[PDB]
Design a protein around this motif. Structure first.
Motif, short mmCIF file in Angstrom:
data_model
loop_
_atom_site.label_atom_id
_atom_site.label_comp_id
_atom_site.label_asym_id
_atom_site.label_seq_id
_atom_site.Cartn_x
_atom_site.Cartn_y
_atom_site.Cartn_z
N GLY B 4 -46.32 -13.29 36.50
CA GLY B 4 -45.02 -13.91 36.30
C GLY B 4 -44.98 -15.41 36.47
N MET B 5 -46.12 -16.09 36.41
CA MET B 5 -46.15 -17.54 36.49
C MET B 5 -47.26 -18.07 35.60
SD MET B 5 -47.62 -18.09 40.36
CE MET B 5 -46.50 -16.88 41.06
N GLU B 6 -47.12 -19.34 35.22
CA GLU B 6 -47.97 -19.93 34.19
C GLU B 6 -49.16 -20.64 34.82
OE1 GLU B 6 -44.03 -19.53 32.01
OE2 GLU B 6 -44.70 -19.95 34.05
N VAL B 7 -50.31 -20.55 34.15
CA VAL B 7 -51.54 -21.22 34.55
C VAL B 7 -52.10 -21.96 33.35
CG1 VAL B 7 -52.03 -19.43 36.26
CG2 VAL B 7 -53.09 -19.32 34.01
N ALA B 8 -52.98 -22.91 33.63
CA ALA B 8 -53.62 -23.71 32.60
C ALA B 8 -54.94 -23.08 32.19
CB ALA B 8 -53.86 -25.14 33.09
N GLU B 9 -55.20 -23.08 30.88
CA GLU B 9 -56.45 -22.56 30.36
C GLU B 9 -57.61 -23.46 30.77
OE1 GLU B 9 -55.87 -19.37 27.00
OE2 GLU B 9 -57.42 -19.90 28.46
N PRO B 10 -58.83 -22.92 30.81
CA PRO B 10 -59.99 -23.77 31.16
C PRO B 10 -60.25 -24.89 30.17
CG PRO B 10 -60.67 -21.56 30.47
CD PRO B 10 -59.21 -21.50 30.72
N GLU B 11 -59.75 -24.79 28.93
CA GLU B 11 -60.03 -25.82 27.94
C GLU B 11 -59.28 -27.12 28.25
OE1 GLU B 11 -59.40 -22.08 25.38
OE2 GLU B 11 -59.38 -22.52 27.53
N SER B 39 -54.86 -21.96 39.41
CA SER B 39 -54.38 -23.26 38.94
C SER B 39 -52.98 -23.10 38.33
CB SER B 39 -55.36 -23.86 37.94
OG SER B 39 -56.63 -24.06 38.54
N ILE B 40 -51.98 -23.26 39.18
CA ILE B 40 -50.59 -23.04 38.80
C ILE B 40 -50.01 -24.36 38.30
CG2 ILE B 40 -48.32 -22.30 39.57
CD1 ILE B 40 -50.38 -20.09 39.42
N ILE B 41 -49.36 -24.32 37.13
CA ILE B 41 -48.67 -25.48 36.58
C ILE B 41 -47.22 -25.44 37.04
CG2 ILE B 41 -50.22 -25.52 34.60
CD1 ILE B 41 -47.92 -24.45 32.91
N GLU B 42 -46.65 -26.61 37.31
CA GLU B 42 -45.27 -26.72 37.73
C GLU B 42 -44.45 -27.42 36.65
OE1 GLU B 42 -44.25 -25.39 40.54
OE2 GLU B 42 -46.13 -25.07 41.63
N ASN B 43 -43.13 -27.40 36.82
CA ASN B 43 -42.22 -28.09 35.92
C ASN B 43 -41.60 -29.29 36.64
OD1 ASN B 43 -39.76 -27.30 37.27
ND2 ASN B 43 -39.35 -25.65 35.82
N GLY B 44 -41.40 -30.38 35.90
CA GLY B 44 -40.80 -31.58 36.43
C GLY B 44 -39.78 -32.16 35.47
N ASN B 45 -39.06 -33.17 35.97
CA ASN B 45 -38.00 -33.80 35.20
C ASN B 45 -38.23 -35.30 35.19
OD1 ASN B 45 -35.48 -34.66 34.06
ND2 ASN B 45 -34.57 -32.73 34.74
N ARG B 49 -35.47 -35.23 30.99
CA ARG B 49 -36.16 -34.30 30.11
C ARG B 49 -37.19 -33.51 30.92
NH1 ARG B 49 -32.11 -35.91 26.78
NH2 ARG B 49 -32.86 -36.63 24.75
N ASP B 50 -37.37 -32.24 30.57
CA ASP B 50 -38.32 -31.40 31.29
C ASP B 50 -39.73 -31.55 30.75
OD1 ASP B 50 -38.68 -29.51 29.05
OD2 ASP B 50 -36.92 -28.43 29.71
N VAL B 51 -40.71 -31.47 31.65
CA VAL B 51 -42.13 -31.61 31.32
C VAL B 51 -42.92 -30.65 32.21
CG1 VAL B 51 -42.02 -34.02 30.54
CG2 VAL B 51 -42.43 -33.50 32.95
N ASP B 52 -44.18 -30.45 31.84
CA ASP B 52 -45.11 -29.67 32.65
C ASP B 52 -46.04 -30.62 33.40
OD1 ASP B 52 -44.09 -27.21 31.83
OD2 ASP B 52 -45.43 -27.11 30.10
#
Lengths: 885, 100
Positions: B4-11, B39-45, B49-52
């Motif tokens: 249920g949470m996003e991670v970054a691919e190894p590439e 390796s969990i990615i978060e969201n920011g502002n 505007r929203d970004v990763d």
């Protein structure tokens, strides 16, 4: 026929220039919306995902939406489907009864896997839809016969099939079964003048649930709801002033007709306006379904010039401009101007800049003069951006400060802002004409009230009445002033400022042209307050909040569509008036379309809400899931017309997770028959055991039995059989609990096989819980293959945890030639896997209790009755006889 | 996607370890898989505007240049467009030019 189109003087009569209608204008608006972004992305370098901006056929989509209303969710059959069958052994008094519902249910969707969540969601949706489709039916004209003065239902209508078991029986059991068959009499069957037949049959519980709910809904919804819907339509038509015929609708109901009704008129508008990013689609739909058909009328040619003698004629100040004709682009911009005028806050005008034209400088000045008294920038809504207002103010300043006659004195102020000076002998102040969005000082709505509230509306979301420049629509019928007295504040101030600037001929021209302007805004007010009232109109909250968000620059979820126009287009639109001639063709059909749209959206929303909890309920099965997966799964099994309506502006490429998750949480529903049936089916599907997938899978080493064949006929009569079906699970003690992560970790270390073997040699039990598995059912009369005799719940490929499992029922057969020790072997054979299901599927039952499943009550309409769908008669033009409260 | 949470691919990470996985043993492979799943990615502002936002690897001068470019973009997005458009409006008012 209507008194506002009666013309008694030739002042309002002019030649017809062109004409426009709703279906043309909606497509025009969509095309001009899409072409702008296409041009912007083509001109400059952009980095974005590849999406194609096309325009659909709105008429075809509306026709498909209307055709969606003729579909039916129920079926009318003579007999119910078979729900029980039997398997005959070599025994003479025992059989194996099987419930067919589970067997058909086990082969509906694809096998569940651990890496395709979208297919899992699709399988769940397909199973729920199959349950709903099978459940809903109405019985009609069942066959019956006579026996000893009673009416007895045929064996055909009974949901039990027992033909293949009759020959093997004996005399006593056959007599008992015949007596049981003859006892299923039709209750209250000996009387005439009936309407239903009541009898006893057999059916599965989940189908029975939807059957009972459908019967209850049919009994419940009746003439009262139809009366309420027609009353609401009558109120809406009263607001819209639609003419009525002298034909009325009565409440008489024939003795041989049963009504059904799957839709209701008082649509909750919130369900329409909770769709994410749907402002453009709603506006386009409103233009398509509500706009009337009219034509443009030019003013009378005698207003500018009059003839005293054949060589003596008065000349107008704008003779060059009035002696000109528009091109195609200018006509399109005029249509844009009127489209922006007829929708206050949703469409906003801007300026178009291109170096491909050479226009006279006076055109810009005249346009700047016209725009102040043509548009509105007041304190409650606006028709233009701040940049266009600034450009118009600059143009007005340039027009004022350019003098082709003797110069008059002017006093400049301290600041260098435009229109910051006093002009004329009497020192008229021109600071009031600079744009100020807080009060609307320089434009229409200066000191007038343009949005009011009069009466409760049939649509609760929109209650406002728009009055452009203070004109009420009744002024065309019962005026309150003479021809001279027609005026308003901003226009009079414009005239006085023009007189103070030394321009008298222009003031005279405008004073002559004023009543045509007033009548034009009166017609626009009548149009916007009469025909455009629909669900797709903007609610009051967003309409009130539009202006402050634009002033503060804050983010808003109802961003207006902005279009651009040219300078000469202002003059061209000023020299025309829009006069409707015909009403919209689909004016009396639209509410049914809106009800269908709302019902489909509500069904979709409830499906999403029920599917949203799957990850919380079962975490290990849906590791790689997102809301988008079940979003696509739900959208893949919906009517295409609703999707076409929802995606007019290609919105579906831009919704993120948060928007759809917000939309699912919103508590707004539109009740209907389809919604009730879907909700009942979903309630019946909460127990995953009815969907035939579970996680009660065990492994325990067991021996295939070797019975002693000491008495052949006794062994045949007792009916021996084997299965891996568990009648009761073992205790919590003496079992071990495995998990997906633990099993994966132990398999990656090369320790899984040894651990399982060590557990097996200790005579214990293991549970592979946490993962749902598809379960199949098979019957065998000989020794089954080793693929299922010694199967495993996992597969080697690292291991795969979700592998389908087959429950098998093995039937033993013996002959008279078998010795009593003919089935024993030196080395025993083993079977590993077992499955526990709390339901009851396959049972060994004595022949005397074959007909013991007759415990359901069935009510069937007679053959003289008719069932009709009356949802197509819910039209606006229908008037009922005795009015309701 | 994981739990249920996003991670970054190894590439997208600034490392290259594709050719070392074949020779690894079981424990090391499991540890690398868990570390990659951690390796969990978060969201920011930024600029309303929203970004990763995530964690990666880079050399010091390249990272300095990239950080300066990101800061310049962030500052532009909230001040420079408005200031420039205001200057266009004032210049067009003064010199009698209409800017689109």
């Amino acid at each position: 026929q209507r008194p506002e189109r009666i013309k008694t003087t030739p002042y309002l009569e002019g030649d017809v220039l062109s004409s426009d209608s709703g279906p043309l204008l909606s497509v025009f608006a969509l095309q001009e919306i899409m072409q702008k972004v296409r041009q912007v992305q083509a001109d400059y370098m952009t980095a974005t995902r590849e999406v194609d901006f096309t325009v659909p056929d709105v008429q075809k989509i509306l026709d498909d939406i209307k055709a969606l209303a003729a579909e039916q969710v129920y079926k009318i059959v003579k007999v119910p489907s078979i729900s029980f069958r039997h398997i005959v052994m070599q025994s003479r008094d025992r059989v194996l009864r099987v419930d067919t519902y589970y067997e058909e249910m086990s082969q509906v969707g694809d096998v569940i896997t651990e890496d395709e969540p979208e297919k899992f969601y699709s399988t769940i949706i397909k199973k729920v839809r199959f349950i709903r489709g099978k459940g809903s039916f109405i019985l009609h004209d069942i066959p019956t016969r006579d026996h000893r003065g009673m009416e007895v239902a045929e064996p055909e209508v009974l949901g039990v099939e027992f033909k293949n078991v009759l020959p093997v029986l004996t005399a006593e059991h056959r007599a008992m079964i015949q007596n049981a068959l003859d006892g299923s009499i039709i209750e209250n069957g000996n009387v005439a003048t009936r309407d239903v037949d009541v009898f006893i049959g057999a059916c599965s519980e989940p189908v029975y649930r939807i059957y009972n709910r459908l019967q209850g809904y049919i009994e419940a919804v009746q003439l009262q709801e139809l009366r309420n819907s027609i009353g609401w339509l009558e109120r809406l038509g009263h607001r819209k002033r639609i003419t009525y015929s002298q034909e009325v609708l009565t409440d008489f109901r024939r003795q041989d007709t049963i009504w059904v009704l799957a839709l209701q008129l008082p649509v909750n508008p919130q369900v329409v306006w909770d769709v994410p990013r749907s402002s453009i689609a709603n506006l386009i739909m409103n233009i398509a379904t509500c706009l009337p058909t009219g034509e443009y009328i030019a003013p009378n040619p005698r207003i500018s010039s009059i003839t005293l003698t054949q060589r003596i004629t008065t000349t107008g100040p704008f003779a060059i401009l009035t002696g000109s004709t528009p091109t195609a682009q200018q006509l399109n911009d005029v249509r844009k101007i009127y489209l922006a005028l007829m929708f206050p806050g949703q469409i906003i005008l801007d300026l178009k800049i291109d170096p491909g034209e050479r226009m006279d400088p006076a055109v810009r000045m005249v346009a700047g003069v016209v725009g102040h008294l043509l548009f509105t920038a007041g304190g409650r809504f606006t028709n233009l951006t701040q940049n266009m207002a600034r450009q118009l103010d600059i143009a007005l300043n340039d027009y004022l400060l350019y003098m082709y006659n003797t110069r008059v004195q002017v006093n400049y102020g301290p600041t260098g802002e435009p229109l910051d000076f006093q002009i004329g002998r009497n020192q008229y102040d021109c600071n009031v004409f600079r744009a100020d969005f807080a009060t609307g000082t320089g434009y229409n709505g200066w000191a007038t009230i343009d949005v009011e509230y009069r009466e409760p509306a049939p649509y609760v979301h929109a209650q406002r009445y728009i009055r452009y420049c203070g004109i009420d629509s009744r002024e065309l019928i019962n005026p309150t002033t003479y021809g001279i007295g027609m005026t308003y504040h901003c226009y009079n101030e414009m005239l006085r400022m023009l007189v103070a600037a030394g321009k008298d001929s222009e003031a005279a021209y405008f004073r002559s042209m004023l009543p045509f302007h007033m009548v034009r805004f009166a017609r626009i007010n009548q149009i916007i307050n009469e025909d455009l009232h629909s669900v797709f109109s903007l609610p009051d909250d967003m309409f009130n909040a539009l202006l402050p968000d634009l002033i503060a620059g804050a983010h808003q979820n109802a961003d207006p569509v902005v279009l651009d126009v040219s300078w000469i287009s202002l003059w061209f639109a000023f020299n025309r008036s829009f006069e409707p001639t015909h009403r919209n063709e689909m004016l009396e059909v639209a509410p049914l379309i809106e009800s269908v749209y709302a019902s489909e959206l509500s069904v979709m929303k409830v499906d999403m809400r029920h599917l949203s909890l799957m990850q919380r309920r079962f975490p290990d099965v849906l590791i790689q899931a997102r809301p988008s997966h079940f979003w696509k799964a739900v959208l893949n099994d919906s009517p295409e017309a609703v999707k076409a309506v929802m995606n007019l502006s290609h919105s579906h490429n831009f919704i993120n997770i948060r928007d759809m998750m917000r939309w699912v949480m919103l508590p707004s529903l539109q009740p209907s028959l389809k919604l009730a049936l879907e909700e009942e089916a979903w309630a019946a599907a909460n127990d995953f055991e009815d969907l035939m997938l579970t996680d009660q899978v065990y492994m325990h080493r067991d021996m295939l039995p070797e019975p002693r064949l000491d008495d052949i006929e006794r062994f045949r009569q007792e009916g021996f059989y084997y299965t891996n079906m568990l009648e009761a699970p073992p205790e919590i003690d003496r079992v071990v609990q495995y998990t997906y992560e633990i099993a994966r970790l132990q398999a990656n270390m090369g320790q899984f096989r040894a651990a399982l073997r060590r557990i097996m040699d200790d005579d214990d039990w293991v549970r592979f819980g946490g993962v749902l598995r598809t379960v199949r059912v098979k019957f065998y009369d000989a020794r089954p293959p080793d693929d299922v005799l010694q199967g495993l719940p996992f597969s080697y490929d690292t291991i795969k945890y979700a592998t389908e499992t087959t429950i098998f029922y093995l039937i033993y057969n013996v002959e008279f030639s078998n010795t009593p020790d003919s089935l024993v072997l030196i080395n025993p054979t083993y079977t590993m896997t077992k499955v526990f299901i709390n339901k009851r599927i396959v049972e060994r039952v004595r022949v005397g209790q074959i007909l013991a499943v007759l415990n359901r009550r069935f009510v069937a309409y007679k053959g003289k009755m008719r069932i009709m769908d009356i949802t197509q008669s819910l039209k606006m033009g229908t008037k009922l006889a005795a009015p309701t409260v």
